[PDB]
Design a binder for this molecule. Structure first.
Ligand SMILES: NC(=S)c1ccc[n+]([C@@H]2O[C@H](COP(=O)([O-])OP(=O)(O)OC[C@H]3O[C@@H](n4cnc5c(N)ncnc54)[C@H](OP(=O)(O)O)[C@@H]3O)[C@@H](O)[C@H]2O)c1
Ligand SMILES: NC(=S)c1ccc[n+]([C@@H]2O[C@H](COP(=O)([O-])OP(=O)(O)OC[C@H]3O[C@@H](n4cnc5c(N)ncnc54)[C@H](OP(=O)(O)O)[C@@H]3O)[C@@H](O)[C@H]2O)c1
Ligand SMILES: [Ca+2]
Ligand SMILES: [Ca+2]
Lengths: 415, 415
């Protein structure tokens, strides 16, 4: 049977014509998450409820509905149930959901549950905004210069999970086919050799870049940068870059700037010129440290987006406070972006900032911008007050050490 | 015919039993490089000659021999000669060589000439040391904490150059084979889809990691860190990690630290315990900013090494002064690690620091440690004197602006 309880009071969010219809009493599924999920999720629930309560004076209220994935799912549904079918059904049915960090088992041939959720629900946009909160300790001199939004492709690239183990019958079969049927001469050592496949498609690329450009338009951003390693991977990474520029030209009236290759796209709402440009991935990892102010919206493939989002989070001292969304055409899943940190689980110690800012993204996605703004306001005030969790406090002079739950309260206090 | 002139005075370096036999008058092939190669290469030649002259009081002298690759090769050997066979022969024959940056053409289906040199000569180690020079402007607060040596695998990974263009007959053929014969269900969009292949082998992994560990032993370093994304790419990146730890156990008496997974390897020369450990790639890009002091020698695959070496160079304000070597069992090629920057070519403007420090690596590789030490000493003094090229000067208060050639002289002045 199902162990999920549909809330008595509460109504389902619907989708008509690519627009969400959010009732005053939306049911929002949430996954508590394993490890420190037990610490950060309740802090998130309280902070969100408070922002919603304050923003709309009791007129609106989320009906939270617990659903399962990860270690907790095995405890609820039994031994080998890490990702129950009903969880996929419920996220699609209720349109908007949030999760803590997840335990994926090792030794049982199971692939990342985070990636499973993204792929099964076709949540092809991994959306990671990275900004600086004044007062956050940072290893760089000018973290305030970083204000970027990463659009990471979620459905393709080496993340597809297509690979075969060295010395397996399947690997030999693939290698045999490549060498004998495809005439491949470039495998340096064809014995005891693992093999992985990297796909990149026009449709996959264009739906991702389309979203990145519409976002820049909607939020009056200054540029979209395609980041790629196309000089070495001509037909995957290079094709991503070419398809990206082509989409700009074909759907958004992009026009050559000078002799190229950059394009200008006219914001139909503000008349601002949005620059469409590109940077090679290795150079980009240097540019985000050396010239962060020159970058805004980023569009890139799965693996590059993984690396870029994490490298940027570290700049802004945001390793434990980086928000994230996974968005598709039919539903969306917001998430803590850190791991399960089991050594601290239950100690009410870790930073709930990441999952709280993903909840800020969730509220904004719902059109509840007022409540979202209150969360941003609360976060800004609490950090500026130097009333923070251990991860910040240990890097600061004369700050005040707060528990996880207490930092949640400090956010509410600063709304 | 050949347009290379073998120097009248000078003798060939030989190799016996994995040990270089370097005469007092070694012939060293060099490739000038395109674009700013014309600026940085002569500065390198002068600085090296001066260090060698001073170190050994005229007893030793390099006989430089120009050889060709890139744009200059087409001017010397004709239209489509970007990489003449003789260049590969000469680098292998003379054992040690150095190059400026290279022009690879676009639009002619030619792959990276840098990668061509590495693969054709089986230079399977890309060696990139990253340290801080006092006085260098840096975007981070504590660049002095960064002192790492990157061992980047050079012969495998997606760099192999194995891929087919979307909509090509070959791509369809591969995709057909994967779906129908291999039962692949994970290609999200199989139409208009480019495909690349990622190989990783036991032999490829182990020769790279073996070198990294022998280096840590020889240079009394504190740890070797395997960096990988093995949680997503189990059979390539994950296999690299497993093979790395296994090599440590099997060849260097690595023993479990606590419950693992880290190992300790006893330095047979100093008795120091070298830690063998591992970090996931996205987290590692955060750790190099947040905990740089915890890292020393790094061993990783081709693409990850590309990104890591560049991200680290940016930390230490070393984007134009990062040295690099490509080392195999039979020869070695030292290189400027920046591009050709054609907008400045011939202006005697850019930083020759990168190619000069690669020449420092070359001299050290030759066993000429005294001359190498003089280059390090000169570089340290010149930068500390704030007498530097435009790339440093523009980031500094009250420094003195020097031309490329003049910075070369300043290095000599500080020896
Ligand atoms: N099979 C599983 S579950 C698996 C395995 C590997 C990777 N991953 C994935 O890779 C990512 C990293 O996970 P992981 O397991 O390797 O890292 P974790 O062990 O979960 O966390 C590593 C460290 O990050 C810091 N940290 C994490 N969350 C924090 C918070 N909210 N506040 C303050 N500090 C925090 C803590 O650092 P300090 O100890 O220094 O304070 C913690 O010890 C996650 O997305 C995870 O899903 C998953
Ligand atoms: N087909 C070819 S040749 C190709 C194409 C793409 C990439 N690549 C490879 O990718 C890497 C980057 O090359 P690229 O062509 O994209 O970059 P480049 O145009 O060669 O250089 C880009 C910028 O880097 C800075 N720079 C480079 N060398 C410097 C030095 N010695 N001193 C001071 N500043 C320096 C300059 O920045 P500022 O203008 O700000 O002062 C320069 O404008 C190279 O390894 C290259 O081989 C090659
Ligand atoms: Ca990540
Ligand atoms: Ca590079």
């Amino acid at each position: 049977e199902s162990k999920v309880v549909v809330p008595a009071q509460g109504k389902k969010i619907t989708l008509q014509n690519g627009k969400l219809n959010v009732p005053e009493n939306p049911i929002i599924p949430y996954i508590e998450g394993d490890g420190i999920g037990v610490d950060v999720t309740p802090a998130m629930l309280k902070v969100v409820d408070a922002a919603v309560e304050k923003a709309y004076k009791g007129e609106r209220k989320i009906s939270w509905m617990e659903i399962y994935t990860g270690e907790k799912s095995t405890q609820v549904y039994g031994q080998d149930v890490w990702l129950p079918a009903e969880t996929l059904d419920l996220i699609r049915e209720y349109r908007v959901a949030i999760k803590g960090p997840l335990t994926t088992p090792v030794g049982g041939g199971i692939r990342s549950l985070n990636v499973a959720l993204r792929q099964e629900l076709d949540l092809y946009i991994c959306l990671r905004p990275v900004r600086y909160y004044q007062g956050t300790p940072s290893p760089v001199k000018h973290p305030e210069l970083t204000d970027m939004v990463i659009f990471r492709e979620n459905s393709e690239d080496i993340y597809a999970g297509i690979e075969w183990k060295a010395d397996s019958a399947d690997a030999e079969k693939v290698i045999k086919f490549l060498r004998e049927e495809m005439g491949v001469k470039k495998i340096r050592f064809p014995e005891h050799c693992g093999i992985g496949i990297k796909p990149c498609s026009e449709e996959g690329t264009k739906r991702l870049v389309r979203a990145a450009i519409e976002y820049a338009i909607a939020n009056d951003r200054d540029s979209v940068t395609l980041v790629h390693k196309g000089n070495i991977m001509k037909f995957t990474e290079g094709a991503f870059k070419d398809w990206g520029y082509q989409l700009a030209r074909e759907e958004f009236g992009g026009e050559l700037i000078d002799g190229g290759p950059w394009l200008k796209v006219k914001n139909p709402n503000t008349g601002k010129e949005i620059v469409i440009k590109d940077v090679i991935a290795d150079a980009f990892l240097q540019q985000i440290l050396l010239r962060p102010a020159e970058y805004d919206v980023i569009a890139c493939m799965n693996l590059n987006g993984d690396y870029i989002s994490d490298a940027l989070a570290a700049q802004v001292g945001g390793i434990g406070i980086a928000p994230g969304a996974n968005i598709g055409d039919e539903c969306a899943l917001f998430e803590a972006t850190h791991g399960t940190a089991p050594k601290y689980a239950g100690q009410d110690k870790v930073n709930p900032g990441s999952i709280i800012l993903s909840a800020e993204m969730m509220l904004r996605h719902m059109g509840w911008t007022e409540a979202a703004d209150l969360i941003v306001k609360g976060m800004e005030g609490a950090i500026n007050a130097k009333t923070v969790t251990y991860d910040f406090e240990r890097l600061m002079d004369g700050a005040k050490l707060l528990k996880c739950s207490e930092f949640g309260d400090a956010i509410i206090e600063n709304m």
